[PDB]
Amino acid sequence: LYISEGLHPRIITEGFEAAKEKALQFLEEVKVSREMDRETLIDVARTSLRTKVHAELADVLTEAVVDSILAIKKQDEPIDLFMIEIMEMKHKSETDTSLIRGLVLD
Amino acid sequence: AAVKTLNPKAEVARAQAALAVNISAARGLQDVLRTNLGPKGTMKMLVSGAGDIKLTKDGNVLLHEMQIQHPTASLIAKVATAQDDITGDGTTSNVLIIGELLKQADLYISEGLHPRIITEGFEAAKEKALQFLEEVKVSREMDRETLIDVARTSLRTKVHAELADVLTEAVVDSILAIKKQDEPIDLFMIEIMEMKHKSETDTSLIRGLVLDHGARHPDMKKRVEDAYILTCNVSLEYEKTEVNSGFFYKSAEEREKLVKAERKFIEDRVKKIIELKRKVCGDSDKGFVVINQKGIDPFSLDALSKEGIVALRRAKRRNMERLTLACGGVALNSFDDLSPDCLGHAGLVYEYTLGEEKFTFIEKCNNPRSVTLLIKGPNKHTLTQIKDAVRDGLRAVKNAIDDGCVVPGAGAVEVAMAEALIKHKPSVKGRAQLGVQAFADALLIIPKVLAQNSGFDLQETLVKIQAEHSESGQLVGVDLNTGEPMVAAEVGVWDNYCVKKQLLHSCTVIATNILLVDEIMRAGMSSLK
Amino acid sequence: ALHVPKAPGFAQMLKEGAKHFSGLEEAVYRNIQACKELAQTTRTAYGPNGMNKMVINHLEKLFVTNDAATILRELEVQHPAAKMIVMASHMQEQEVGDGTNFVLVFAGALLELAEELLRIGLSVSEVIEGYEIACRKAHEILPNLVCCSAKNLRDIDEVSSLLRTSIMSKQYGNEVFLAKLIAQACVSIFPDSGHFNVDNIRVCKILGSGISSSSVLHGMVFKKETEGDVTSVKDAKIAVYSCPFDGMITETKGTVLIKTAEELMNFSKGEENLMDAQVKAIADTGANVVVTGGKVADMALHYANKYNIMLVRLNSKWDLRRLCKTVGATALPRLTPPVLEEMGHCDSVYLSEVGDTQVVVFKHEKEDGAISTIVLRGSTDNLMDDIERAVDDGVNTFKVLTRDKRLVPGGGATEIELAKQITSYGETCPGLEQYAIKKFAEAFEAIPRALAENSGVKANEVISKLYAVHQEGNKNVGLDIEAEVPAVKDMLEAGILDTYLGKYWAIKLATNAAVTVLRVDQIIMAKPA
Amino acid sequence: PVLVLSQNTKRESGRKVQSGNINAAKTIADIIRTCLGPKSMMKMLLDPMGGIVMTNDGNAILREIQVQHPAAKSMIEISRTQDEEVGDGTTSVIILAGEMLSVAEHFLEQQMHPTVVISAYRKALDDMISTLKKISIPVDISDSDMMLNIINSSITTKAISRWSSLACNIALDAVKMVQFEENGRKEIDIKKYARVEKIPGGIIEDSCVLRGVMINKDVTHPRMRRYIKNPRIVLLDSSLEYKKGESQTDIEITREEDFTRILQMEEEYIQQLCEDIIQLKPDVVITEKGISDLAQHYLMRANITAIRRVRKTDNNRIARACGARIVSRPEELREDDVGTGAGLLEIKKIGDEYFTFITDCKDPKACTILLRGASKEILSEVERNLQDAMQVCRNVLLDPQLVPGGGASEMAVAHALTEKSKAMTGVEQWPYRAVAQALEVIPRTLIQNCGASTIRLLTSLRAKHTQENCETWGVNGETGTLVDMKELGIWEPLAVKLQTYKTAVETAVLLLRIDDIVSGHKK
Numbered sequence A: 001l002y003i004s005e006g007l008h009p010r011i012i013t014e015g016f017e018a019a020k021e022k023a024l025q026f027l028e029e030v031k032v033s034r035e036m037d038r039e040t041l042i043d044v045a046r047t048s049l050r051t052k053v054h055a056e057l058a059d060v061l062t063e064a065v066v067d068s069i070l071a072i073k074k075q076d077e078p079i080d081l082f083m084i085e086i087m088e089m090k091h092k093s094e095t096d097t098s099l100i101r102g103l104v105l106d
Numbered sequence B: 001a002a003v004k005t006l007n008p009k010a011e012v013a014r015a016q017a018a019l020a021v022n023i024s025a026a027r028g029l030q031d032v033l034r035t036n037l038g039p040k041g042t043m044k045m046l047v048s049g050a051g052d053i054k055l056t057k058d059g060n061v062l063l064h065e066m067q068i069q070h071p072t073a074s075l076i077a078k079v080a081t082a083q084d085d086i087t088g089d090g091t092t093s094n095v096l097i098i099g100e101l102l103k104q105a106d107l108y109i110s111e112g113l114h115p116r117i118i119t120e121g122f123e124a125a126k127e128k129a130l131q132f133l134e135e136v137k138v139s140r141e142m143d144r145e146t147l148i149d150v151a152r153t154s155l156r157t158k159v160h161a162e163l164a165d166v167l168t169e170a171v172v173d174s175i176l177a178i179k180k181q182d183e184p185i186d187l188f189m190i191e192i193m194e195m196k197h198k199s200e201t202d203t204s205l206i207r208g209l210v211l212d213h214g215a216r217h218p219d220m221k222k223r224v225e226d227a228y229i230l231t232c233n234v235s236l237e238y239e240k241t242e243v244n245s246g247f248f249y250k251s252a253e254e255r256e257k258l259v260k261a262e263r264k265f266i267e268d269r270v271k272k273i274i275e276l277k278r279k280v281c282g283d284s285d286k287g288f289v290v291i292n293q294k295g296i297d298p299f300s301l302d303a304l305s306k307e308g309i310v311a312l313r314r315a316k317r318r319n320m321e322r323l324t325l326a327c328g329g330v331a332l333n334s335f336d337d338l339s340p341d342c343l344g345h346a347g348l349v350y351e352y353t354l355g356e357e358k359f360t361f362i363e364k365c366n367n368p369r370s371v372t373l374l375i376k377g378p379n380k381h382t383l384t385q386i387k388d389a390v391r392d393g394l395r396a397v398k399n400a401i402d403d404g405c406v407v408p409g410a411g412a413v414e415v416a417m418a419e420a421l422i423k424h425k426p427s428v429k430g431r432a433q434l435g436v437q438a439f440a441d442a443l444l445i446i447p448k449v450l451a452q453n454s455g456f457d458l459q460e461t462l463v464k465i466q467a468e469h470s471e472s473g474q475l476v477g478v479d480l481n482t483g484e485p486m487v488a489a490e491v492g493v494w495d496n497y498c499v500k501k502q503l504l505h506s507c508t509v510i511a512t513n514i515l516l517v518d519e520i521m522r523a524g525m526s527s528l529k
Numbered sequence C: 001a002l003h004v005p006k007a008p009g010f011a012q013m014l015k016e017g018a019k020h021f022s023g024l025e026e027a028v029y030r031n032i033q034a035c036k037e038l039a040q041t042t043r044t045a046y047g048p049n050g051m052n053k054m055v056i057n058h059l060e061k062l063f064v065t066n067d068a069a070t071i072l073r074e075l076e077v078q079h080p081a082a083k084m085i086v087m088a089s090h091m092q093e094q095e096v097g098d099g100t101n102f103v104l105v106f107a108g109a110l111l112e113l114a115e116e117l118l119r120i121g122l123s124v125s126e127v128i129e130g131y132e133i134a135c136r137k138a139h140e141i142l143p144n145l146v147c148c149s150a151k152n153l154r155d156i157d158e159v160s161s162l163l164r165t166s167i168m169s170k171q172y173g174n175e176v177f178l179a180k181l182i183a184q185a186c187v188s189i190f191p192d193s194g195h196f197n198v199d200n201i202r203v204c205k206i207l208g209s210g211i212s213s214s215s216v217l218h219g220m221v222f223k224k225e226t227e228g229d230v231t232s233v234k235d236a237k238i239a240v241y242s243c244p245f246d247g248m249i250t251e252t253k254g255t256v257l258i259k260t261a262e263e264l265m266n267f268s269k270g271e272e273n274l275m276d277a278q279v280k281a282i283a284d285t286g287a288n289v290v291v292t293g294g295k296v297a298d299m300a301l302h303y304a305n306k307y308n309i310m311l312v313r314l315n316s317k318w319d320l321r322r323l324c325k326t327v328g329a330t331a332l333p334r335l336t337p338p339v340l341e342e343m344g345h346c347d348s349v350y351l352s353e354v355g356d357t358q359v360v361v362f363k364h365e366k367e368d369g370a371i372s373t374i375v376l377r378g379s380t381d382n383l384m385d386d387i388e389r390a391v392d393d394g395v396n397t398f399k400v401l402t403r404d405k406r407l408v409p410g411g412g413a414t415e416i417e418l419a420k421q422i423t424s425y426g427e428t429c430p431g432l433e434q435y436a437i438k439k440f441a442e443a444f445e446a447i448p449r450a451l452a453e454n455s456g457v458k459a460n461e462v463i464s465k466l467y468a469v470h471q472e473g474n475k476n477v478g479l480d481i482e483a484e485v486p487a488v489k490d491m492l493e494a495g496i497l498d499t500y501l502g503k504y505w506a507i508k509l510a511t512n513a514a515v516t517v518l519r520v521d522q523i524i525m526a527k528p529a
Numbered sequence D: 001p002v003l004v005l006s007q008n009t010k011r012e013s014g015r016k017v018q019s020g021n022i023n024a025a026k027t028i029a030d031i032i033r034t035c036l037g038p039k040s041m042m043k044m045l046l047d048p049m050g051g052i053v054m055t056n057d058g059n060a061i062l063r064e065i066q067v068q069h070p071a072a073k074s075m076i077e078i079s080r081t082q083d084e085e086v087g088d089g090t091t092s093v094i095i096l097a098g099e100m101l102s103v104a105e106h107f108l109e110q111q112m113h114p115t116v117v118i119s120a121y122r123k124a125l126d127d128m129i130s131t132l133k134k135i136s137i138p139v140d141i142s143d144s145d146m147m148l149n150i151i152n153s154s155i156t157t158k159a160i161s162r163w164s165s166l167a168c169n170i171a172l173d174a175v176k177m178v179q180f181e182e183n184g185r186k187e188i189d190i191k192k193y194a195r196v197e198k199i200p201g202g203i204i205e206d207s208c209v210l211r212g213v214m215i216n217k218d219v220t221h222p223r224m225r226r227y228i229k230n231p232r233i234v235l236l237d238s239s240l241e242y243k244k245g246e247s248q249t250d251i252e253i254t255r256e257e258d259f260t261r262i263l264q265m266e267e268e269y270i271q272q273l274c275e276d277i278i279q280l281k282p283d284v285v286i287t288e289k290g291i292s293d294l295a296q297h298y299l300m301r302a303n304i305t306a307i308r309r310v311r312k313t314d315n316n317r318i319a320r321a322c323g324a325r326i327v328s329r330p331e332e333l334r335e336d337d338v339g340t341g342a343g344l345l346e347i348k349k350i351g352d353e354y355f356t357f358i359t360d361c362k363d364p365k366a367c368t369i370l371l372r373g374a375s376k377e378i379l380s381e382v383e384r385n386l387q388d389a390m391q392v393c394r395n396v397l398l399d400p401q402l403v404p405g406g407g408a409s410e411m412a413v414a415h416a417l418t419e420k421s422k423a424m425t426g427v428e429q430w431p432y433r434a435v436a437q438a439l440e441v442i443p444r445t446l447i448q449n450c451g452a453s454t455i456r457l458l459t460s461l462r463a464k465h466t467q468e469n470c471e472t473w474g475v476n477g478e479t480g481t482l483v484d485m486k487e488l489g490i491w492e493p494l495a496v497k498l499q500t501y502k503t504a505v506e507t508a509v510l511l512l513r514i515d516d517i518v519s520g521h522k523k
């Protein structure tokens, strides 16, 4: 919009850099530091799964994902998502997706 | 899609596709033509498929010569062709304003605004802008100085500066010569002849006529001082009878008699001409020039040469009127009762040979209501360029005379109309204010491109100009040598009120229709085969 | 201006042979049309009066059937939405075994009515909401539509009366015979535990006589011959080996390293004496029949003939496992004589000739066992395959009844009651969801309509009669196919019943498929490799 | 190969053929579905001649597209039929036919016979006609304001809507001037005697209808006058040249004077023709054929202005406008054949061309509509819209009955048909009520193209039309709301809506009767 009016892209990118700096600052200011409780994690996982799948399946997958993470997580120790297997079975309805507190070998 | 289920080889651009296609083509045309605008513009070279060269800065010529096969480009070329046929100038600005209207409308349509609402804003802004134009137009007594300034504003954009300073006086004098008080100007009465021998600054105004042919008898004089001009439309060559006739004779003597007799009909017209010549020129003091719209056979040419008459044949249907207005005689379709009142006078008639071509000058008429512009130049493409430029200049001066008003130039009216539109915008109901804003930002493309072409910063220059126009209210535009604001009416940069009005009208109309296009479709035979 | 260019953006960046569809018209309506075409391809096979189709696949193999899932598999469905509906039908076949044509019909009907609603002005989101709410209501209702229950799966007359309906749609003319056969087999292999395995019903198709010469056999049949001289055995003591009937050899390369004429002279005699000892130990355990999953050696065959043992070679490992399950034996990986528990028993093992075919029969006399075989006779391989599909339908119905013993009335009675109740629910539901609920209800009418259309009567009269009777109160009334005119009768009293679980899963899967097809909005196909 | 029919003869039959025809028809409908109503959008069509057609007119679109399915061919033909008959409704008819075929597809899938469906459709058509004639209202065609409102209600849906008042006045003036009666036979021929001349450039706001005619012509000789303030005009079908005879008139010359005598005889013949013309003392002479230069000489000597080669149609319009009578033998010229009635002959330069005006006539029974605008395409669209407007004005002057627009008429008729269907007890009540509900597509389409909620608005409208005196209620195509047409002003000609309904129903009947396509066979 501004380069067609003869503005130089170098100047536009300088403005981009300034705005990026200020935006990162404002982001650090507005972030909400919260004790990560099951309810907060449920809201987060819902916010993602409701965008990615149907609403009822999202209400199922939310509890599934949050419980899985709250199960394979050790206090102050990076979460190894490899320790959450993901097995697919092709027989029943999609709302039967569950969390097995164990393992399922194929 | 729907059309493609019935005609499988069908091409279709729907809703958003259609708009993207049209706006892209319009912006492409604008991108090409941006450089034509103004005297600081750049000349483009155009090479035909045969290799012929064209040097042009004219928007219409550039459009028609570019190699384009786009439907939107065809639409805009047609709008420019109408602009050129009716006004002679404004084609580049027309294309630019169309492209910028489309761009400024896409700016808001990409954000989900409807093009119908944008077009409502376009129409409101068009109305208000036409009003403001009528308000700012300068109604002026069209004197030679004003016409000179107008023709300068056109010719300096179309050609080089010294050649523009020559063509200015040439064009203004030509129009001020073929112009009768309160009588629409017939530009046909300005002949335009090109000669390809001398420099381009030798282009002059002959206060008379220049025919692209001369006498076909060698013994005929090449220069005549005090000439009676006989403008005729009578065949002086052998004419066969309508009904098939044929000659029948029984002896070579009878054949000879029939050969002498078959020409008596044309000999009689030659005798009438010769008798008029003898009756009006009792001696060799004056001269006598016959100019025939039709042919003259060698026998008639010999008969006229023997009596000292200069006969030109196969003149032009327009040269009949041009000669009757320059010399001052009567053009004849018959020699039934020809009299000395049927003759015109030219204080000089002579011939000019240039390689294989001949020219005949008819000058020193008393008060010729028809003249000719002799386009001299070293190249065919130079001559074509000067022809285009003088067309532009003639149209400009004619329009400035017709519309006794004249509008300031250099983007001044565009700036002022943008400001007026922006001050009027709140009075518009709904989101058509956005269409109005788009119209204003589109009108602002003329000063923007003028600055861009003179080598200045569009935003900085436009801000300076708008600030100066807002503080003072004076109509200011771009000074192409300093980038500063300048008063166009004081510095002599004038535009045609008719041209600006036609711009507003036609650009608004075509942009509205393009914005309202929602489907481009080729589902016909695709060829006449 | 004779070509529409691709619009800037995705249309230009798209690959060569790729296609992009977007919107209700290019994507949704074309998907619905494809699914409707699919439902039309399979509609004429629904019900007892359904006609067979002869589909030839790309391998030039011929299938003559009216089994929807089989027809779909052997068709090369290439439209992706139709592929998804076929995926739903195949999931129904996997989960239940019967109802695939119901799934197809219902999905196509739901999609047609969804197109209708989208045209009247509903949004895909609202249509999907209403379809889901109506599927939930239907699932809530069906348990109340359950009319009878099995009450016993160890009987042979009741089980036949229960399987007759499922094996009536296929093979309508002769279904009592087939229900007798399949009931005998299912109750033979039904253990005291409630678990029932459909793989324990084996089907042997032998080309001869006719479907009425078919029989059930408590045991196993193999189109094999015996390796040795013995062909019959009356008190079988089968010993089963997964290893060949040869001397065990090393998995590492073995070499006979001879260094003396004595070793050379004695090697072969020692080898054969070893083989004789092995086979004599096997015979001395009492085994009179040996079944090897591998190959047979000439010396071992010699000694089996010497010691009067019937040798059988089963190339397949599933066949070997099923024989072990049948006779109560254990496959030994070594040629060691079996212990008293590893041995199997059969009341008879003999070689017979059913038709042109030679067969080895392991036949129990008791009316039980772990595996039962249905020997299908027939005049055509295609006919026998169709009867095998009908047998599979009956067996899957038996398993569905072992899972859930509840039954709903057939012949369109449950569908009509569902339609009525869901219409009454939608008439109460306010908001824009009522249109979609009522269309979901009206979709059920497609089932009795298809039944009537194939019976050869006016579906409109049939459906009006059904609605009238179900309004007056009879929920077990459905259409009578044994009537040249539109007629109706008590499906329960007639014995025409479906499985609650079958209907449940069919409705669920059809609704899910329709809703997914609707949830699709853009399609980006790649260039077909 | 021993065939019975030639290869390339492919024969389809049955429900596949029926569904194919119905899908082709409703596809033709879906092509132009969005071009209905006041808020429609333009379409840019690409001609086979490198041309462009930017339009909203259903018939223009269907005329520019090419198809191969015979059902689509039939739909294009019925659009052409509607356009030629009434000159409006070219997409309403297409949409109605598509909807009727769509709703008949239902009954066809359900084992109903096409003849049963067709008889039901014909019953419904008769009752539609009855209901329209009942709800129609008369018009006082002497009320210029009423006529201007009718023309606005007909052109509001087109590009010229921005210049609605101008176009309405132009169309009304043109039709009222072309209205002509002779021997007790009224005739509004707006195709031969209302001419549209498109001159690109200028501005549309200066477009006008002339009290006369206009041609693209100049004087034959620049000594002729270009301005005459009360011209007496003569029109000729014959050449004022000396042409040959019909027979083998070969001459044979043996004497000397005979050649010259023959050429002088030709000249004297031209003189005698010109004298036969001058004897009537005209000011202007207009010919469809040539005029020799000697004839020009004699006419100029008589102070006559001549125009050389005019078209036969332009000459007929000049006759109707200035009150002259075309002649073919100047010897047979009479004062009654001379043209008095023109108030001014002017020949002015528009751009770089010379145009001849014969305007200022009194009681001119012919006219020229001079259209000016931005480009040939814009002016072609303006001309098409003006053709629509004039055809509507003509339809009104012929049948002064009006019906309400905005879909009000469609909803009124649908309601009347639903009410009449309750007495029907046979099996045709269902297709009858189906076409009744298939009429709702017009207001449905209006709502869709304005961008409002079809479900809600159509429900509210069907409910409004169940009350007693609400058959005038319709929808706005500009806001998406229900209004009374008595208050909005959108009133269509009863003739237009009758032709629409009739053509739609008959097209449906035809395509339903059709089965068993055959093809390939070569004429």
Ligand SMILES: Nc1ncnc2c1ncn2[C@@H]1O[C@H](COP(=O)(O)OP(=O)(O)O)[C@@H](O)[C@H]1O
Residues within 6 Å of the ligand: B036, B037, B038, B039, B058, B059, B089, B090, B091, B092, B093, B094, B153, B154, B156, B157, B158, B408, B409, B410, B411, B446, B450, B477, B478, B479, B480, B493, B494, B495
């Ligand atoms: N000497 C000048 N100084 C500033 N502006 C000028 C001058 N001459 C012309 N212009 C402006 O340049 C614009 C474009 O001129 P020109 O190229 O002749 O018209 P077009 O772009 O339509 O061909 C005109 O609107 C005029 O106002």
Ligand SMILES: Nc1ncnc2c1ncn2[C@@H]1O[C@H](COP(=O)(O)OP(=O)(O)O)[C@@H](O)[C@H]1O
Residues within 6 Å of the ligand: C045, C046, C047, C048, C050, C068, C098, C099, C100, C101, C102, C103, C165, C166, C168, C169, C170, C409, C410, C411, C412, C451, C479, C480, C481, C496, C498
């Ligand atoms: N004797 C009968 N009379 C009426 N309807 C029957 C009879 N037997 C079966 N049906 C109906 O036919 C349908 C079964 O058709 P079928 O082709 O098996 O469909 P699917 O294979 O999808 O279950 C059932 O809905 C049942 O109600």
Ligand SMILES: Nc1ncnc2c1ncn2[C@@H]1O[C@H](COP(=O)(O)OP(=O)(O)O)[C@@H](O)[C@H]1O
Residues within 6 Å of the ligand: D035, D036, D037, D038, D057, D058, D088, D089, D090, D091, D092, D093, D153, D154, D156, D157, D158, D404, D405, D406, D407, D446, D475, D476, D477, D478, D490, D492
């Ligand atoms: N302003 C308006 N509001 C609502 N409906 C209108 C309006 N103007 C016209 N209509 C209706 O739109 C219908 C079709 O308009 P038009 O596009 O001119 O005809 P067609 O669809 O045949 O081209 C007419 O029946 C008329 O009743």
Ligand SMILES: [Mg+2]
Residues within 6 Å of the ligand: A048, A051, A052
């Ligand atoms: Mg996300």
Ligand SMILES: [Mg+2]
Residues within 6 Å of the ligand: B089, B090, B154, B157, B392
């Ligand atoms: Mg210019």
Ligand SMILES: [Mg+2]
Residues within 6 Å of the ligand: C098, C099, C166, C169, C393
């Ligand atoms: Mg079944």
Ligand SMILES: [Mg+2]
Residues within 6 Å of the ligand: D088, D089, D154, D157, D388
């Ligand atoms: Mg109309």
